[PDB]
Amino acid sequence: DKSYCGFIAIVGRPNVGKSTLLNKLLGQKISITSRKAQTTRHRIVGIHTEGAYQAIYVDTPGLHMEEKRAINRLMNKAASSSIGDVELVIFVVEGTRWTPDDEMVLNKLREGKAPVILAVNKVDNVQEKADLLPHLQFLASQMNFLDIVPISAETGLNVDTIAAIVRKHLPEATHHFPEDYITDRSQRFMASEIIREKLMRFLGAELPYSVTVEIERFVSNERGGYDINGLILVEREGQKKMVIGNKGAKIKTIGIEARKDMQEMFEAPVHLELWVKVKSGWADDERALRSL
Amino acid sequence: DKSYCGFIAIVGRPNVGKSTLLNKLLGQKISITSRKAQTTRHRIVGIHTEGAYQAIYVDTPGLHMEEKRAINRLMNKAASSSIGDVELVIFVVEGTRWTPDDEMVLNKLREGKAPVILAVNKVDNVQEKADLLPHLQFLASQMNFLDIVPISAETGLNVDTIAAIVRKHLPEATHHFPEDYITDRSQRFMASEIIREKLMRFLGAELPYSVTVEIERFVSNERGGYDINGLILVEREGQKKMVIGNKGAKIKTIGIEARKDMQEMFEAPVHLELWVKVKSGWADDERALRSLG
């Protein structure tokens, strides 16, 4: 009978695992991690809808009036239509690291009426726990966190835990967005989206969890046309062989079919270059082929 | 800062002026009056958005849960997403007429939490007011109407007044719908929509502040294809002469362009038959041109 919907923040200095945490929270089988300097004007970074709950994830602790009108334009709603406020904040930090950049973010939060969760990422990396406890005690000394939760974004350590608090903070309200609305309407996202389907379609029963599509390059040329470079990141090594398939079949197909739509959708032929890769890093041979 | 949005009803027995009153409220220059005896599952009949206010006009006094689930689907929202309730009701009646149908509607209303405005339509068409006063006093005995207001079907007598009470009844809330959302996603509406553009594109606003498009026919054949019949309705006579244009050029163009998008925007071919008409009834020649095919 009742539904809940609200905005939630995910802040932290760059390269802390924010994007990885977001994808785990969005709960999509095949995710789409973009690398944009092109900061949205609405700051929406993803929307998780499930049952009566709709959490709208933003990358700002507080939503400006400017950001409120932009969210409305995104929804094609009157600029005057009411938009709430951030109800929770997930402050992500990296293990035992603490730069003036981490403080910069922390400084912007404390000065708010929104509760904040400290998400300590890559906590397993710190092989010297003798660094951890002292650190965590120093962190908690920075402000009153609603909670301090250590996570592994690539394992989903305490993502369910953060998922639960997040929902507890969704105010009673009607959803602002239709279920599968797109906040990224760029061609670059359209591209990632076509690859995503081809993987889902062609991998079939062999699709593993945690796959991530991403456009490393989308451009035109001095000779004209659309140069698109797809990056299909996977968790394991053997998984990488799946996406590639027998003789290179599966990755061949996914690429022709994906290129097809990229052309049917966009209005220009595209030279699509699809690269499978394990998130832990390229391999020797791969690093070689990546230079050819 | 604040914003308001809520559902409002427009009830009444058929052929009373509900559709005309609605278009007047929607405030659109060129309106699109359907005739869909096919009743929606969401019951949305139109949405008036302006500034922070968004009134969602339905054709049911009260929204059933089923009618709520359908509204969400229309918006492509989770079935669970909250939908409010009818905050006001416009019960339109025809002049001095009162059938068991008028009563049927009024009975459903009597029992409800929704304030209801009595809209007396075609009031200027009553043969003798000596029928009106006794009637009204008898209507106002049926229940406590928030207000009793007489309106003119095509003049928009007190449409502003009904508009102003309607907005007063919009609860504080966020707009459920994007500004220009379409509640009718049928091809029949897509057609009406194309003629609207062509009128707006070619008439160039020289246009009658009250034109009304309408698909009088949209079908297939025993021989196959798409038989579409457009009905462009205007107020005055010269207006009709405007839409037709010199040598019949304007109406010729509006139809080739309209037929085109209907050709493309739909997958197959269309036999578009566009007919201009004054709402006050056809003419002799026209009736002659119509009475054949």
CATH number at residue A86: 3.40.50.300
Residue type, B266: F
Q: Indicate whether A6 and A143 sit together in one domain.
A: yes
Query: Do A217 and A121 belong together in one domain?
Result: no
Burial environment of residue A247 by CB neighbours within 10 A (0 to 12, 13 to 18, 19 or more): exposed
Residues B174 and B245 in one domain: no
Long-range contacts formed by A25-29: CB under 8 A, 24+ apart:
A25/A55, A25/A57, A25/A159, A25/A162, A25/A163, A25/A166, A26/A57, A29/A200, A29/A207, A29/A209, A29/A211
Same domain membership, residue B231 and residue B177:
no
Based on the fold, state whether residues B13 and B83 are members of the same structural domain: yes
Instruction: Could you list the beta-strand ranges (E) of chain A.
Output: 4-11, 30-32, 44-50, 53-58, 86-94, 116-121, 147-150, 211-219, 226-234, 270-278
Residue written as token pair 């945690």:
A210
> How many angstroms separate the CA atoms of A210 and A152, rounded?
13
Contact B179 A2 (CB under 8 A): no
CATH number assigned to the domain comprising residue B262: 3.30.300.20
The count of residues in chain B is: 293
Residue owning tokens 């990632």: A192
Q: Which residue has the tokens 């739909």?
A: B266
CA atoms within 13 A on the CB side of B77: 26
Query: A113: which 2 tokens?
Result: 């009426």
Distance CA B138, CA B116 (A): 16
Based on the fold, state whether residues A33 and A167 are members of the same structural domain: yes
Are B90 and B208 in a shared domain?
no
Residues of B in contact with A75 (CB under 8 A): 178
| CA pseudo-torsion sign B62, B65, B71, B77 | positive
Question: Within this chain, do residues A50 and A104 fall inside the same structural domain, yes or no?
Answer: yes
Q: Is B190 on the interface with A (CB under 8 A)?
A: no
User: Which candidate from B1, B76, B179 shows the least CB-CB separation from A179?
Assistant: B76
In terms of domains, do A267 and A283 share one? yes
Q: Are A55 and A47 in contact (CB under 8 A)?
A: yes
Buried b or exposed e, range B110-130, using 16+ CB within 10 angstroms: eeeebbbbbbbbbbeebeeee
Sheet containing B44-50: give its strands across: B44-50, B53-58, B4-11, B86-94, B116-121, B147-151
A287 shares its domain with A165: no
Q: Final residue of a domain: which of A181, A201, A216?
A: A181
Of A181, A213, A234, the residue that ends a domain is: A181
B144 closest CA partner among B87, B190, B106, B93:
B106
For residues A241 and B34, what is the distance between their CA atoms, to the nearest angstrom?
58
CB-based contacts of A241, cutoff 8 Å, min separation 6: none
> Is A76 in contact with B47 (CB distance < 8 Å)?
no
Q: How far is B254 from chain A (nearest CA, A)?
A: 29
* Dihedrals phi, psi of A276, to nearest 5 degrees: -80, 150
* Domains: count for chain B: 2
> Domain boundary residue among A141, A164, A181?
A181
C-beta atoms of A82 and B178 within 8 A: no
Please check whether residue A191 is in contact with residue A218, taking contact to mean a CB–CB distance below 8 angstroms.
yes
Question: What residue has token string 């009830």?
Answer: B11
Taking the C-alpha atoms of residue B1 and residue B23, their distance in angstroms, rounded to an integer, is 28
| B103, B134 Cβ separation under 8 angstroms | no
In chain A, count of helices (H) and strands (E)?
9, 10
The token duo for A17 is 């695992």
Min CA distance, A184 vs chain B (Å)? Answer: 18
The two tokens of residue B174 are 């966020």
Q: Which domain holds residue A283?
A: 186-291
CA distance A77 to B179: 5
Strand, coil or helix: A150: strand
Write out the H or E segment, with its range, that includes residue A196: helix A187-203
Q: Are residues B18 and B71 in the same domain?
A: yes
Residue A82 touches chain B, beta carbons under 8 Å: yes
Is B78 touching A (CB cutoff 8 A)? Answer: yes
**CA–CA dist A249, A179 (Å, integer):** 35
- What does each C-alpha distance from A228 to A190, A233, A288, B9 come to in angstroms? 11, 16, 20, 52
In this structure, are A133 and A234 located in the same domain? no
> Which residue intervals of chain B are DSSP H helices?
18-26, 65-75, 100-110, 129-139, 159-168, 187-202, 237-244, 249-264, 284-290
Q: Which chain B positions have a beta carbon within 8 Å of A6's beta carbon?
A: none
DSSP 3-state of B60:
coil
Closest Cα of chain B to A148: distance in Å?
A: 31
Kind of pairing, strands B86-94 and B116-121? parallel
